[PDB]
Design a protein around this nucleic acid. Structure first.
Length: 88
DNA sequence: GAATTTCGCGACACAAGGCCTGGATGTATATATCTGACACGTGCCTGGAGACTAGGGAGTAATCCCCTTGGCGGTTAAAACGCGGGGGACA
């Protein structure tokens, strides 16, 4: 149900992880996000938080920023929500 | 010492290179002619454009592992260098 990258991100605090470490964000989407500005994982975390942890809003924002499809956005949102529940 | 004579000198001659000049030739140019091949105009009709749908190809992440890179220590096989010379390039 969960990719290994998902668990690896969830287990420990993000600290200074690159945006490419998020579940559902690979090389291409990572590079697009870095161009768009969100060049650190905690930056995407903050963008998640500002949207009040909402699901649909965050998924639409991710699709509109880097162009990810349903699955990649869903994985990123799920990993971020679990990380918030585990450390926030 | 005088006269006759052989070697050299100057005038005549000849020969060769370089330059001055003109003609024959071909080349580029102005004028004039004209034709047939390029340019434009029209009918139509066949091919390109537009709207819509289904589905498969491709994009993108996740993951494994292999194989490419880098490093080390010896061990020589091969490269560098100099030197004499003779055969090959060049005129």
């Amino acid at each position: 149900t969960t990719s290994q990258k998902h668990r690896d991100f969830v287990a420990e605090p993000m600290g200074e992880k690159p945006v490419g470490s998020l579940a559902g964000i690979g090389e291409v989407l990572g590079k697009k996000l870095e161009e768009r500005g969100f060049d650190k994982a905690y930056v995407v975390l903050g963008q998640f938080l500002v949207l009040k942890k909402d699901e649909d809003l965050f998924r639409e924002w991710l699709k509109d920023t880097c162009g990810a499809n349903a699955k990649q956005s869903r994985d990123c949102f799920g990993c971020l929500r679990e990380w918030c529940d585990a450390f926030l």
